[PDB]
Amino acid sequence: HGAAQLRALFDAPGTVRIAGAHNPLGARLAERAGFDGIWSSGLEISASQGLPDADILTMTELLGVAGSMASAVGVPVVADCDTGYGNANNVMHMVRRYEAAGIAAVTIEDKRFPKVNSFIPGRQELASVPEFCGRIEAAKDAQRDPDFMVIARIEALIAGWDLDEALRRGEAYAAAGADAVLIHAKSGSPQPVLDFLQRWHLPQPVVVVPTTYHTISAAELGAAGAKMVVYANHGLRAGIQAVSQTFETILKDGRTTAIEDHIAPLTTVFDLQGMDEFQENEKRFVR
Amino acid sequence: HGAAQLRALFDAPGTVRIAGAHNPLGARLAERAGFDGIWSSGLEISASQGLPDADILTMTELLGVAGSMASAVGVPVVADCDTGYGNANNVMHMVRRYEAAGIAAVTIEDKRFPKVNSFIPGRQELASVPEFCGRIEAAKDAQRDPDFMVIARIEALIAGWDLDEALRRGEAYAAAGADAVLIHAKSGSPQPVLDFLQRWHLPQPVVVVPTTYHTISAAELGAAGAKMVVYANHGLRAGIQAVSQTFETILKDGRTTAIEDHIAPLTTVFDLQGMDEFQENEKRFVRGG
Amino acid sequence: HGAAQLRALFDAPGTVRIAGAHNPLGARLAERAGFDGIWSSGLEISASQGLPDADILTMTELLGVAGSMASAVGVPVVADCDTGYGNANNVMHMVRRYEAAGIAAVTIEDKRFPKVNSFIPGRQELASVPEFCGRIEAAKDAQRDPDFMVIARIEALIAGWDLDEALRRGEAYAAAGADAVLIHAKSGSPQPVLDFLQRWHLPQPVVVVPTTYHTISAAELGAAGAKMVVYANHGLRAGIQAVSQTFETILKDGRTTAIEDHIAPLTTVFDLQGMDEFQENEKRFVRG
Amino acid sequence: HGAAQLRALFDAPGTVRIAGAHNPLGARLAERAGFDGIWSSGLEISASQGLPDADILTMTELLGVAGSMASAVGVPVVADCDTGYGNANNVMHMVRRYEAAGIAAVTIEDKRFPKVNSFIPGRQELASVPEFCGRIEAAKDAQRDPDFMVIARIEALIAGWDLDEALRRGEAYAAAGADAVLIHAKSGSPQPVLDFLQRWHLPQPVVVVPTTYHTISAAELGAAGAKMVVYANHGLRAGIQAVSQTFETILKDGRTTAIEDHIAPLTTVFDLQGMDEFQENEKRFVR
Numbered sequence A, D: 001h002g003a004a005q006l007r008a009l010f011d012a013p014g015t016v017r018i019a020g021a022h023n024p025l026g027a028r029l030a031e032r033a034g035f036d037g038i039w040s041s042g043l044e045i046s047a048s049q050g051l052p053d054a055d056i057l058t059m060t061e062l063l064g065v066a067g068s069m070a071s072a073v074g075v076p077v078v079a080d081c082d083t084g085y086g087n088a089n090n091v092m093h094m095v096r097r098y099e100a101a102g103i104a105a106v107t108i109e110d111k112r113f114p115k116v117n118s119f120i121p122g123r124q125e126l127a128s129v130p131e132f133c134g135r136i137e138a139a140k141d142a143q144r145d146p147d148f149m150v151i152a153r154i155e156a157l158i159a160g161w162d163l164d165e166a167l168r169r170g171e172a173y174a175a176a177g178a179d180a181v182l183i184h185a186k187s188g189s190p191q192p193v194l195d196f197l198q199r200w201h202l203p204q205p206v207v208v209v210p211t212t213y214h215t216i217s218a219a220e221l222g223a224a225g226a227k228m229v230v231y232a233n234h235g236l237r238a239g240i241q242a243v244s245q246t247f248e249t250i251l252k253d254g255r256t257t258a259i260e261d262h263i264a265p266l267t268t269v270f271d272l273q274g275m276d277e278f279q280e281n282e283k284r285f286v287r
Numbered sequence B: 001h002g003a004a005q006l007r008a009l010f011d012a013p014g015t016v017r018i019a020g021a022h023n024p025l026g027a028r029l030a031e032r033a034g035f036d037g038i039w040s041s042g043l044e045i046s047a048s049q050g051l052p053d054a055d056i057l058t059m060t061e062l063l064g065v066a067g068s069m070a071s072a073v074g075v076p077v078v079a080d081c082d083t084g085y086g087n088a089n090n091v092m093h094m095v096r097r098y099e100a101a102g103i104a105a106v107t108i109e110d111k112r113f114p115k116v117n118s119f120i121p122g123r124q125e126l127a128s129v130p131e132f133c134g135r136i137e138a139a140k141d142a143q144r145d146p147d148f149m150v151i152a153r154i155e156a157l158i159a160g161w162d163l164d165e166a167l168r169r170g171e172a173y174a175a176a177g178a179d180a181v182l183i184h185a186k187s188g189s190p191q192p193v194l195d196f197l198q199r200w201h202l203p204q205p206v207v208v209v210p211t212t213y214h215t216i217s218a219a220e221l222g223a224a225g226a227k228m229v230v231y232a233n234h235g236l237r238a239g240i241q242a243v244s245q246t247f248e249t250i251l252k253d254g255r256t257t258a259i260e261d262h263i264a265p266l267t268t269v270f271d272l273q274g275m276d277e278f279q280e281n282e283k284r285f286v287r288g289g
Numbered sequence C: 001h002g003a004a005q006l007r008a009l010f011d012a013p014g015t016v017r018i019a020g021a022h023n024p025l026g027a028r029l030a031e032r033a034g035f036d037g038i039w040s041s042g043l044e045i046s047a048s049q050g051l052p053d054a055d056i057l058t059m060t061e062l063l064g065v066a067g068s069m070a071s072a073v074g075v076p077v078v079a080d081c082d083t084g085y086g087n088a089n090n091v092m093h094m095v096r097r098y099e100a101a102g103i104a105a106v107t108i109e110d111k112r113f114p115k116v117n118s119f120i121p122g123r124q125e126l127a128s129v130p131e132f133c134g135r136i137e138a139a140k141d142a143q144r145d146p147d148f149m150v151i152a153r154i155e156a157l158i159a160g161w162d163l164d165e166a167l168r169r170g171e172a173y174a175a176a177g178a179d180a181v182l183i184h185a186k187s188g189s190p191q192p193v194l195d196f197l198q199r200w201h202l203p204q205p206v207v208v209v210p211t212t213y214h215t216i217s218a219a220e221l222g223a224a225g226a227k228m229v230v231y232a233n234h235g236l237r238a239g240i241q242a243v244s245q246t247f248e249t250i251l252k253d254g255r256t257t258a259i260e261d262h263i264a265p266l267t268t269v270f271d272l273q274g275m276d277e278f279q280e281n282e283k284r285f286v287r288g
């Protein structure tokens, strides 16, 4: 149901908000909290494996997570697919396997393989516009259901280019068939993204990821012209802080008693596992 | 080196403490905090996949996590292997694959496949002693490095049998070749496990998992006769509470600003990903024409 | 799509023939030869991994192959699912994952976990009828598309029980919701399976696997009442013989020249990989 | 034991011969026939999955096969690792994972990601010498056991360059630390490869893959100066022919009777599965 659900979110009024996750449990927590969908974060999934976010994990590993989350929740999954895992032929294979796994949208960025993630310091190399437009065209040609979305992510500002270049690239990617564009920035100031949104005059919706420019609200981003806001890695970052503090306290105290009232009870874990339904089906069918 | 490291921990004085994890990042956080090793928790791993802890995930999926953690950290991984994934022949296949993946020890419990999590209420079925002893013998026969450990987990108290039955089973499992035994209990009082520890007289060390009887300290458990203490699911439970609250706050506030100072900074994530070494190696070896 | 295709094969007249395969290439060869569908054989897949056919491979490993075959060919895949990988809760999990991966039908047999391959000698242990009927009921409850099929495999004759017992079990499995039954036997004579078909009065179709009683044709089995005939492991057995002989000849001769005219050319491999389309798409979309 | 075994083969007199395989069964058949080791073939594995040999399969998928073969047989596995799955940092991650899985040697080629099977027509793109030397240096820095081997595969002839270019590339790769070089060629004549061997004066050994120039014997290649000869895809090609003919015959005849005496009996399959030892262990431990 994923791609149909995401199209309905884009076709209805209001700002769409999605949250990063790196396993089915995190996706289920975001769904329960009330997010509209899931972002299958390259950073969260890489970090969960103890590894760089630099196409060190393969498409097989990243798709494995995205697909397991897609089947675990009833909201759409939007996948972070780095640069598309190679050339236009890799992109087509990517689309076929992500679409078949029920992912609603895939996001590819205008860099070359292997991904240099946005937080690497210094000038960064961009893919040429003709080569990246070929990847976008190939993605649209490979998909089977028209509801599936291909999101073209613009790293021009990240890489050291100006807003004119970011808009030139976004307009080319839209012309190549991208269903949405994602303008990225790593400044504290939201102003470069607000400027992009104000100058964007094509019908394709714009996606934003306010990791660094966090002071701007989803409502303000929506009023400025963004359709979807991605909270990409806050679950991971919250988990790291809570788990390291928990482990430190257990070792220092020599027991868990002081943290028992500050962590999830086992009954909450069992609920998140679906144990009520599991036990009912055991009663019905296990003889 | 995991198996050699775990044997050193058991052969040295002091109480060994290990923490549950369900991916390499959790294992690395436990190592950095100072735990002696990792517990590859069936509960944590199944919960992370949104699924019951009931042999719904397969050995393939559980080994994938245990092995990725074993290569990610420099402390031993002790694996929770449910009932051994079938009969003694499945147990042998399990030992071969887990040992090759660098896991230091595997734990199999005296129940029948598929596992019922110990916190399932009501009376639970135990494996017969001859059948489970064969699983233990098969495991010791399949391993290649003598340092590798097979831990026999005793669910007799969980299932509602008495202390003498738990002791009869543990002693049979030790005679069958288990390197250690794990006595489990789900009461809030530590006395049931304390009673087992006082009456255990064999040389094999005893493992305990104080999830429910959490008020007893590791030092007290060690003084009573336990050699290893397992904190099996507190990382998962802490993570669930924090992530839920984070997601709730982001949706309510309309932005993340109010939790930025209460979650790990990006630079901490990068450190945990190994980016210092990665960027050094990029500078050393990645070059153009 | 697989399940609807398989229903169409069962709803139209004629004997359905499927072949065993253990990777997408084998499935594609079976499709090109003209088989109606694929059998995702536990024996072929376990043997391909050098391992016993005894639930040593896990559901994850067996599903990975079945699902990759289902996406690679345009004929339905019928999966060999051993005993269902545990109790009725495991069976439900299996159905959800196999259906999502586009498998058309799953086959579970009335034995206990872990499976003993039907060719293991001596008396074997059967699941109780109530317990197995619970697995069948759970499977039907877990599926989403009504076209998906659950095939109940009867091991009663394999295990040493008589025909009355195989029929009692088959009739119970049909009443529990199985879409088809598979009656197995391992003698050289087809008579035990023919005797079953003579006494089968239920509308559910019957599946047969004539590995040992190979002298009866698919058309003779169909004339006797069977609907689907499974050739379960002949591709693996042919490949083993040919690859062993090829390896021995290369070592003896010192070169491959004497076998070049008797093995597939690389152009055939490229065609099986879809290189014509791959190259066209490179021309259309890979740009500087 | 694999890396030590392969070193012993390279250190002893004689020409090493290995055969391609794409699963543990095929490796076991090569071992039983008497091959010295296994070539974990990118063409055979991709083909077995119905897909192009063009880095469409990922490192995860290719390593899964190579590692399962390495633990299934008692001869060394030499892995076909395409271009190394990205840049020098991908190469390092590859080495760490392949070495931990017991693979004896990895082979990377001097092309850019994603590769094209050498049998693609026209001038092909080579990696620059500095960039590829950096991959080799990284691979050698990442390995832990000195017995593990990194084989530098030279695609210059495949790509339409002359012998002088293939030799100068090989010479640079050897100085960068490659343990052996593989000279590839797709002529029917063996003479280009013989001429490379005559003109190669360096101590690093040379690997050859006589797929197209199949008329030269292993003994003749060894006498000309090659140390290892790879029969890369004959098992797959023999299997395809036999399986297609088997399926055609079953459909035409209506039964398998006419092929029963011409395919492996089930007892041979059981032996290859290890059933004798499996049954003994059943008797020993299953109670």
Ligand SMILES: O[C@@H]1[C@@H](O)[C@@H](O)OC[C@H]1O
Binding pocket: A021, A022, A023, A025, A026, A027, A029, A235, A239, B048, B235, B236, B238, B239, B240, B241, B243
């Ligand atoms: O794995 C995570 C769990 O441990 C916790 O942190 O909450 C969300 C999950 O993604």
Ligand SMILES: O[C@@H]1[C@@H](O)[C@@H](O)OC[C@H]1O
Binding pocket: A048, A235, A236, A237, A238, A239, A240, A241, A243, B022, B023, B025, B026, B027, B029, B239
């Ligand atoms: O996935 C987890 C991450 O989100 C955090 O919770 O810290 C430890 C990891 O296991």
Ligand SMILES: O[C@@H]1[C@@H](O)[C@@H](O)OC[C@H]1O
Binding pocket: C048, C235, C236, C237, C238, C239, C240, C241, C243, D021, D022, D023, D025, D026, D027, D029, D235, D239
């Ligand atoms: O899977 C293959 C089997 O079918 C046969 O062809 O011999 C070699 C194996 O690799």
Ligand SMILES: O[C@@H]1[C@@H](O)[C@@H](O)OC[C@H]1O
Binding pocket: C021, C022, C023, C025, C026, C027, C029, C235, C239, D048, D235, D236, D237, D238, D239, D240, D241, D243
């Ligand atoms: O992998 C196999 C290939 O080697 C050949 O044997 O034909 C069928 C395939 O399944």
